[PDB]
RNA sequence: AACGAGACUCUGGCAUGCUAACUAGUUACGCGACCGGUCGGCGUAACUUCUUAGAGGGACAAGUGGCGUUCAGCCACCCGAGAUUGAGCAAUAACAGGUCUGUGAUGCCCUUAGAUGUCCGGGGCUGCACGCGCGCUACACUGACUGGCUCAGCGUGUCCUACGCCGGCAGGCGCGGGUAACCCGUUGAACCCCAUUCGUGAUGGGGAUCGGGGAUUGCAAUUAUUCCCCAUGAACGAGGAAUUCCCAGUAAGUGCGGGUCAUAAGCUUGCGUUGAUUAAGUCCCUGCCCUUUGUACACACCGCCCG
RNA sequence: CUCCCCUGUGAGGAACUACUGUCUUCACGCAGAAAGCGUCUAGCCAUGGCGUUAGUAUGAGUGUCGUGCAGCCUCCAGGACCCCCC
């Protein structure tokens, strides 16, 4: 057992407030763009041990994990681990995080609204887009 | 020799009441090694009077849905519960099962009389087998409700509820529901 | 006072829903006193019942 | 009421784990974690240290349920 | 005396006695291996306990002891594989039940060449502010995850699929066996069992809703058919009045086969596995049955009938 | 009308510190009540459930201080006894 003197009770990464008294991978998971799975990838890549609580990490480990997550394809993070595989305009492999995820959502809504397609009409009227049977269910949240 | 879970001794325990002496098992012969005998005691009337008491506590611990079919969960849990009990009180853990059965069982109970929707109860008195059964029910249910989320092991929480059911304290969920039954019995008479 | 009791005979089953058994009680004190009594759950003859109120008598439900 | 438990030990709490627990008769990680307001993993690994120190008898171990007794 | 109940057929339990098996194994002996054994590893004689499936035995309340007009039969015990195996078939009668949509089974009506015909190409049965219903899944500590250890049966198959090699995963390629106790297949199914990580908070419990990509099926997938990787991670804190199904290998958990099927099981139909709490009683409720009884009803109370 | 076996808390002692187990005082978490007041439900009606009293009044246990409670000796008593009454 241990008694760490320097421990960050509140952490800040990528515009988000991280809780480090939690475990490490499941603290990193809190931000958008990361689940437990990609968290285990990034933290097994940065050499950071999973036994440490997220508040015992030096600034160098937080900065090298950040550096690993901003630049996916350089660190041998597999191409099938990327959130958006081929984006519509540039045609590039990019790992999408919080503000970028939300923005890409907004944009992929706007494109389909300007295009005049069915996916977008669906997304517009507040209906489920996958062709679900809307007779019985798809009620809650409505008046 | 016959030793329960390999370390216990069944033949040294004692029964202080005549009503529960004819029913409660594991004294003379019935004492076994392991709780699971997979026998048929529901075959005929009162044929379940004679099955080992430890098995009886065992059977009732599967009583909620996800745990239902899995019996071994219990012979696991009843294993660590006894080995915990001996550490606290320091007596044969099968004396603690006897005392908890004897004390937790109701004595008098109320039978509902009336028309549906209006409960008016009249006091009658418990049959010995019914005493055993209700008692054990109370033990397993007290253990569950107490152990749902306190993050207690059911081993820890059943040793708790059992020792407390044995001493006569109001800690046990068991002694509580008993005390309510007897008190309603008083209300009516 | 707490008393003890013995089952001499089983007579019938009293109840709305057929719950109670109506049984006959000897006293274990070697007294010859005979009282009918209502009991819940399974009963076979020869069993011993513990009575918290020992002077009470049986009524028909 | 919401529950705060210690993730990593404190000196105060450490005095309790160190000087007290060996007198406790029956010892369970949930018992230790209840009276010392420690979290689960920390209390569990605490008893894992009180193993290596030789201050505590280990009776039986099954999966997540462990049984510990005070030394003599 | 006759039909209905039972008997009967189908299924499960018994057989170290019988009939036998290279398309199932066993024992025995050889070779093979690694430290006398362990091995689904390879072959020969030995036989049926295993594994099949035929013949026929076996249970008849039988034996003993209790309750019984000692009568039926009811209870307990022993002897025993079994002292309750689960389904099918189902009388005299009826319903003005469901069936023109299963019928080259039809009586009428309508349609009959810009057809109510049929084929072709698209759409639609799938739509969404709402009610009511089966059913799935969960609300976590008897729990989730991560590794490790050993288990089924019924069936399906010209499509099931052995072993390689390329593939993170779905998938490709290929080279093989089986019309099947031969090949998939010692059908290494899920819990469970043993270690590990988690620590009572919307948490790793729960996963809906989505945004991107890969692969299959097919003419054809947009109105996501499904499958797979990352993300998104919302309701949900054991459920109000009411109510449903159930008595022993049973409730329940858990996977598995058959149906539908080009690709498909949150459905059904079967199959094993882990396996209980409680009752062996009563008409309270609900439901129908008899018996007595009243009747001005008999097209039978949806009756009759009075001003 | 008793006498004398075991139970009590009324008085004297050893012990009391060392021995062990229980009541005091403080930190600790867990169960956790009611008189009532309201609400809902039994056709009408609480004798019930549920809300608020309150997570109050409480009780079972672990570690602190007690110079305690004791256990070992006597009686004073109380009950089993007897008798007696039948
Ligand atoms: Mg009735
Ligand atoms: Mg007429």
From Swiss-Prot, chain A:
- Glycyl lysine isopeptide (Lys-Gly) (interchain with G-Cter in SUMO2) crosslink: positions? 89, 92, 104
UniProt key word Signal = no
Give the main localization category: cytoplasm
GO-annotated cellular components: cytoplasm; cytosol; cytosolic ribosome; cytosolic small ribosomal subunit; extracellular exosome; focal adhesion; membrane; nucleoplasm
Q: Which UniProt keywords apply?
A: Acetylation, Cytoplasm, Isopeptide bond, Ribonucleoprotein, Ribosomal protein, RNA-binding, rRNA-binding, Ubl conjugation
One of the entry's Gene Ontology molecular-function terms is: RNA binding
Q: Which residues form the signal peptide?
A: none
Q: Does the keyword Cell membrane apply?
A: no
Give an example GO biological process: cytoplasmic translation
Subcellular localization is given as: Cytoplasm
Give the multimer and partner information.
Component of the small ribosomal subunit.
What is the protein's name according to its record?
Answer: Small ribosomal subunit protein uS13
**Biological source species:** Homo sapiens (Human)
Name the gene for this chain: RPS18
From Swiss-Prot, chain B:
Q: Which InterPro entries match?
A: Ribosomal_uS7 (IPR000235), Ribosomal_uS7_CS (IPR020606), Ribosomal_uS7_dom (IPR023798), Ribosomal_uS7_dom_sf (IPR036823), Ribosomal_uS7_euk/arc (IPR005716)
According to its UniProt record, where is this protein mainly located?
A: cytoplasm
Glycyl lysine isopeptide (Lys-Gly) (interchain with G-Cter in SUMO2) crosslink residues: 32
Q: How does it assemble?
A: Component of the small ribosomal subunit. Part of the small subunit (SSU) processome, composed of more than 70 proteins and the RNA chaperone small nucleolar RNA (snoRNA) U3.
Instruction: Supply one GO molecular-function term.
Output: structural constituent of ribosome
Record family assignment: Belongs to the universal ribosomal protein uS7 family.
Function according to Swiss-Prot or TrEMBL: Component of the small ribosomal subunit. The ribosome is a large ribonucleoprotein complex responsible for the synthesis of proteins in the cell. Part of the small subunit (SSU) processome, first precursor of the small eukaryotic ribosomal subunit. During the assembly of the SSU processome in the nucleolus, many ribosome biogenesis factors, an RNA chaperone and ribosomal proteins associate with the nascent pre-rRNA and work in concert to generate RNA folding, modifications, rearrangements and cleavage as well as targeted degradation of pre-ribosomal RNA by the RNA exosome.
What Gene Ontology cellular-component terms does the record carry? cytoplasm; cytosol; cytosolic ribosome; cytosolic small ribosomal subunit; extracellular exosome; focal adhesion; membrane; nucleolus
Please report the name of this protein according to its UniProt entry: Small ribosomal subunit protein uS7
In terms of Pfam families, this protein maps to: Ribosomal_S7
A GO biological process of this protein is: ribosomal small subunit assembly
Keyword Hydrolase listed? no
- Annotated organism of origin: Homo sapiens (Human)
Q: Which gene encodes it?
A: RPS5
**Sites of the modification N6-acetyllysine?**
32
Curated annotation (Swiss-Prot), chain C:
Q: Which domain of life is it from?
A: Eukaryota
InterPro entries found in the cross-reference section: NA-bd_OB-fold, Ribosomal_eS28, Ribosomal_eS28_CS
CDD domains under this entry?
Answer: S1_S28E (cd04457)
| GO terms for cellular component | cytoplasm; cytoplasmic side of rough endoplasmic reticulum membrane; cytosol; cytosolic small ribosomal subunit; extracellular exosome; nucleolus; nucleoplasm; ribosome
Q: Endoplasmic reticulum as a keyword?
A: yes
Keyword Ribosomal protein set for record:
yes
Tell me where in this chain the PTM Phosphoserine is found. 34
Q: What keywords are assigned to this protein?
A: Acetylation, Cytoplasm, Diamond-Blackfan anemia, Endoplasmic reticulum, Nucleus, Phosphoprotein, Ribonucleoprotein, Ribosomal protein
Q: What is its subcellular localisation?
A: Cytoplasm, Cytosol; Cytoplasm; Rough endoplasmic reticulum; Nucleus, Nucleolus
User: One GO biological process from the UniProt record?
Assistant: ribosomal small subunit biogenesis
Which one of the record's GO molecular function terms can you name?
Answer: structural constituent of ribosome
Q: Name one Pfam family in it.
A: Ribosomal_S28e
Q: Which SUPFAM superfamilies match?
A: Nucleic acid-binding proteins
PANTHER family assigned: 40S RIBOSOMAL PROTEIN S28, SMALL RIBOSOMAL SUBUNIT PROTEIN ES28
Q: Give the disease association.
A: Diamond-Blackfan anemia 15, with mandibulofacial dysostosis: A form of Diamond-Blackfan anemia, a congenital non-regenerative hypoplastic anemia that usually presents early in infancy. Diamond-Blackfan anemia is characterized by a moderate to severe macrocytic anemia, erythroblastopenia, and an increased risk of malignancy. 30 to 40% of Diamond-Blackfan anemia patients present with short stature and congenital anomalies, the most frequent being craniofacial (Pierre-Robin syndrome and cleft palate), thumb and urogenital anomalies.
Similarity field: Belongs to the eukaryotic ribosomal protein eS28 family.
Family matches, as HAMAP family: Ribosomal_eS28
UniProtKB/Swiss-Prot annotation, chain D:
Positions of post-translational N6-succinyllysine modification: 11, 53
Cellular component per GO, a single term: extracellular exosome
Instruction: Provide the positions where the record notes the PTM N6-acetyllysine.
Output: 2, 11, 19, 25, 53
A Gene Ontology molecular-function term? structural constituent of ribosome
| Entry keywords, A to Z | Acetylation, Cytoplasm, Ribonucleoprotein, Ribosomal protein
Its domain of life reads Eukaryota
Task: Say if the entry is tagged with keyword Acetylation.
Answer: yes
Give the chief site where it resides.
cytoplasm
Q: Name one GO biological process term.
A: rRNA processing
Location of the protein in the cell: Cytoplasm
Give the family per the record: Belongs to the eukaryotic ribosomal protein eS25 family.
Subunit-level organization = Component of the small ribosomal subunit.
**What is its biological role?**
Component of the small ribosomal subunit. The ribosome is a large ribonucleoprotein complex responsible for the synthesis of proteins in the cell.
What protein name is recorded for this chain?
Small ribosomal subunit protein eS25
Name of the gene encoding the protein in the UniProt record: RPS25
Question: From which residue to which, out of the full length, is covered?
Answer: 42 to 113 of 125
